[PDB]
Each structure stands twice: as C-alpha cells, then as structure tokens.
Structure 1
Amino acid sequence: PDDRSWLEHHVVHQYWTARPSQFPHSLHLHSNLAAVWDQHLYSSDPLYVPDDRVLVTETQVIRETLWLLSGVKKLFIFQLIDGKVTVRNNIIVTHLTHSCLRSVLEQIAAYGQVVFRLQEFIDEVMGPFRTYQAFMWALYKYFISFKEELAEIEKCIINTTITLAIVVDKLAPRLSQLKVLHKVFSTGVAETRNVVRASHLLNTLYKAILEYDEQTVSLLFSLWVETVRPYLQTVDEWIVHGHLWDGAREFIIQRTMVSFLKPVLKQIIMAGKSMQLLKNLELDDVHDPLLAITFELTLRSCLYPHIDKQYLDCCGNLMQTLKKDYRLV
C-alpha cells in the first residue's frame, strides 16, 4: 500500500528480500525447464524429494557477481564460510538444470577469492616499513582502474541484454594478469627482520620480469617502479647527504641482498662514506626522462651512469682536496 505497493511493483525485491518470484513467465520448455525436469523426475519416481530454491532470473546474478569481482563484500549470492567465498545452491534460474549454474558461479567465486584476499590485505593497512606501504598503493592503483571498467559495464544494463558468456569473455585480458598477481603475492606473504621481509619480495619482482620478457610486461614494469621508490630515495640520500638514515637498518648492508644494484654497489658504498668525509674537511627525475628516449635488462644498464657520474665527482673532489693544505704527497 502506497509505498509497499510501489515497492512490489516498480522495485524488484524478490530474492534479496524474501518474497517469492512473481516475474512474468511465458512458459514453454526453453524457460519451463524446471517443470519439465520435475515431470521427468516424477516419471523416474523419486518419490517427491522436494528441493527449495528462491527462483531468480539471470541478470540479477550477473550484477551481483560483477559487484563481487569489483571488490565489495557481503552479498546475498555466494555464501561465505570462513573467509572464503563459496557458491550457494539455494538460488535457481529455470533453465541450465541447476548443475551448470553451480559450475559457472563456482568459477566466478574462484576468481572472487583471489580478488578478496588482496583487498583484505589493502584494507588491513587502513584499519616504519615504508616498502609494504609503497606496495599496497600500486596494488590499489591497479584495483581502482580495474573497478572502473566493470562499473561502466553495469551501467549499460539499465539502458539490451547481456549474458554470462559475455561477461566471462569480456574479462579475459584482466583475469589473465590476475593469475600473475596470485603468484607474485604468494611470496609477498611468506615472510622477522624487516629487511629480509622486503628484499625477498623485491628480488622476486626483479626476477619475474624476465619470465614474461605486449601488455603483461608493462604491468610488471609499472608495478616494479613504484615499489623500488623507497630504496632509490634512501640510496640517493646516502650519496648526497653522506649519511645513511637508519630505520632499524632498512638497507641490506649493515652500517640478505638484492640483485638490482649489486654489480655497481661497491661504487655506491664508496660514494656514501666519501661524502660525509668530505664535509668534515633528482635521481628519480633523471630516471623518468630515460623512459622518454630488454625491459629491466638493458634499460637497467642505463640507470648506472646517473649514479656513477655523481660517484666520480664525489671521489675525485675528495682526492683533490686532500692533496693540498694537508698535501699527502
């Protein structure tokens, strides 16, 4: 009556709120499949064994699953057991004989678990390590753009019909890269000291790019650059300010290693120590123009001139100023 009547008419409210379906059906087997299945059961004489499901149409399930894939939680579809999404079987569409439907929703739930755990990790930093913090932001950066596409698609439902086969085949070039993400995160959750807990992940990042060396390798590279930002800054600090800032010794070398800057590292340490002993008597903004003018192999060998020039300048200036007014020779 007057708002409940409008609810019943012009809003759905018939599985997500318990009020059995009055969706108009124009029967005849392509969508009378439940009833013909019941008659076939009766001819096989079950006897009676009655199942209870709530009877939805298909498209509502599609929008709910797209919501599940976007990253929100707590939906009516997909019972949640201990943290893991699992397909519910108390939900029926007339055709697909209730067994196909279970499989398709189980596959979408199999993807939804992978999305949920990552968003769980992202939520757990919102309620000094600084490398985890730089990692989740890049993960988040993937996720917001990823959510944008699905949110676009869901709008076009309101304005045309869209089926399951459309939505699974549409998300192929994203679920491809999601499988990579499932493998990268496995070693980022495998762990005492904060320096090994970061280097173990970062070295896996350095190694994994060569495995795919189109569109995946750019994703890995763009993920790579936003995660080595802390170490780059700290190294540049040790260069130009002479001192290494300690965060319970976040750097690998004590005042566990990475391959990333090892083959020039001796020139770097010999740079840091020399600068503070000189005073006793922009690197990112250079790295980015290099991208304007193989990936993390030969391109990485162009990074070392930036630090090497600075090193040469520092050590030569110290050697020069030691030979006059104390005149070692």
Structure 2
Amino acid sequence: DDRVLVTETQVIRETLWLLSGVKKLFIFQLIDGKVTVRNNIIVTHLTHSCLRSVLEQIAAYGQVVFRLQEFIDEVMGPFRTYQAFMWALYKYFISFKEELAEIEKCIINTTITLAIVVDKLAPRLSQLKVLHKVFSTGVAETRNVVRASHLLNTLYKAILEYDEQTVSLLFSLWVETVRPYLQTVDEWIVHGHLWDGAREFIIQR
C-alpha cells in the first residue's frame, strides 16, 4: 500500500485551514457534508495509525465549523431574526479566526508541533463544543413564527443551565439575537402600531 508521506509542519497549516472553515483541502476531504481524513497520510513517526487517530478528533471539530459555515452561506448567497442571529455567529468567527491566523505567523517566522497547538487552543475547542449543542436545536426545526420562537427560547434556557467565559459567550450571543423583538416591542409602544414582517412576531394579527 502506497502513502503520500507528508511532512510535519504541513499538517498544522492544513489543520488551521480546517479551523478557518475553508474547503477543498488535501487533507480532511469531505464527501457528503462530513469531513473525513484521507487514507495515505503518514509521517516518519506515529506509525500511520495514531495520525489517523489524532486527525480524527480534529475532524470532529471541523464538522462543527463546516456546518456553521454552511449555515451562514445559506443566508448570504426578510426574516430579521436568523439574519440577526448569524451576525452574532459571524462576529464570533472573525475574532476566533484572528487567533488561528496569528498562530500561522509564528510558523513562518520557535519550535511548533502537534501537541502544542492543540493545548494552546483548549479555551477555543471548549467554547466551540457548546455551539454544536446550542445550534443543534436551532437546526432540527416550518412556519416562520415557530422556527424563531423555539430558537430564541433555547438560548434563555441554555444559559440558566450554565449559571467564567462560557457564560460571556452565550450572553453576548443572546443580545444580538433578541435585538429584533426588542425593536418591534418598542416600536409598537411609542409609534402605536405593530410593524412586523412575514408575521415574525408571536401576535399574528
């Protein structure tokens, strides 16, 4: 059986791209919306199997970030809530991307190997696992008023479960998703009329 025998540093660069959410990578070739490690990858060490083990874990993280990127894509290419929800998600990704991008700088310009970049990314791979469970309830579902109510209610329930850095994320993710309702509620009060779109509000007049 033949193998490609990739070098060592090349893997970390590829892993960073998987974290970034980019597709079409020589490693982690997805097939059906499910990232999956290749079969001919081997390093001088690590006996060709531990590599399939360590990559398999990071792959599980790629799924969490690839699916979210697929979600943001299906909104860009007037719900006023999902569109207001992704802007919170999108805002989190830019800052998260900066930490991953910064690491790439210290690679081209100190020794760096696998077991170091992972432990350096512990407080991120932790925060990311939460989103795989918070968003799972925002994707498993047809009317526009039940898809937005059941989503916004899942956050306020999931925060009371976590009552620190994980709470600061969900809270900063909450405010930027309840911004639509707080607007129309105020707009209904002072301007004396309910100005809704697609009957998004729960009061279907």
- TM-score normalised by the shorter chain: which range applies? over 0.9
Q: Which has the higher helix share?
A: 2
TM-score (ref. length: structure 1): 0.61
- Any stretches of 5+ residues in structure 1 without a counterpart? 1-50, 256-329
Query: How many angstroms does 1:217 deviate by?
Result: 0.5
2:79, 2:198 within 8 Å by CA — same for their partners in 1?
no
Partners of 1:206 and 1:83 in 2: CA distance: 30
* CA deviation string 1:17-48 (max 9, x = no partner): xxxxxxxxxxxxxxxxxxxxxxxxxxxxxxxx
* CA deviation string 1:35-88 (max 9, x = no partner): xxxxxxxxxxxxxxxx20111211101111111111111111122221211111
Partners of 1:86 and 1:120 in 2: CA distance: 17
Choose between structure 1 and 2 for higher RCO, CA contacts under 8 A separated by at least 6 residues. 2
What's the counterpart of residue 148 of structure 1? 98
What's the counterpart of residue 26 of structure 2? 76
What's the counterpart of residue 137 of structure 1? 87
Query: How many angstroms does 1:249 deviate by?
Result: 2.2
Which of 157, 176, 180 aligns to 2:126? It is 176
What's the counterpart of residue 190 of structure 1? 140
Partners of 1:140 and 1:128 in 2: CA distance: 18
Moved more, 244-253 or 66-75: 244-253
What's the counterpart of residue 211 of structure 1? 161
SS of structure 1 residue aligned to 2:76 = coil
Compared CA separation, residues 253 and 152, structure 1 to 2 (3 A): same
Any runs of at least 4 consecutive aligned residues in structure 1 with deviations exceeding 3 A, and if so which?
none
2:37, 2:56 within 8 Å by CA — same for their partners in 1?
yes
Which of 49, 66, 86 aligns to 2:36? It is 86
Query: How many angstroms does 1:190 deviate by?
Result: 2.0
SS of structure 2 residue aligned to 1:227 = helix
Query: How many angstroms does 1:94 deviate by?
Result: 1.0
SS of structure 2 residue aligned to 1:101 = helix
CA RMSD of aligned residues (A): 1.0
Query: How many angstroms does 1:252 deviate by?
Result: 0.9
Query: How many angstroms does 1:192 deviate by?
Result: 2.2
Partners of 1:229 and 1:178 in 2: CA distance: 23
* CA deviation string 1:263-312 (max 9, x = no partner): xxxxxxxxxxxxxxxxxxxxxxxxxxxxxxxxxxxxxxxxxxxxxxxxxx
- Any stretches of 5+ residues in structure 2 without a counterpart? none
Partners of 1:189 and 1:171 in 2: CA distance: 27
Query: How many angstroms does 1:245 deviate by?
Result: 1.1
Query: How many angstroms does 1:148 deviate by?
Result: 0.2
Query: How many angstroms does 1:182 deviate by?
Result: 0.5
Q: Is residue 2:169 matched to residue 1:233?
A: no
What's the counterpart of residue 47 of structure 2? 97
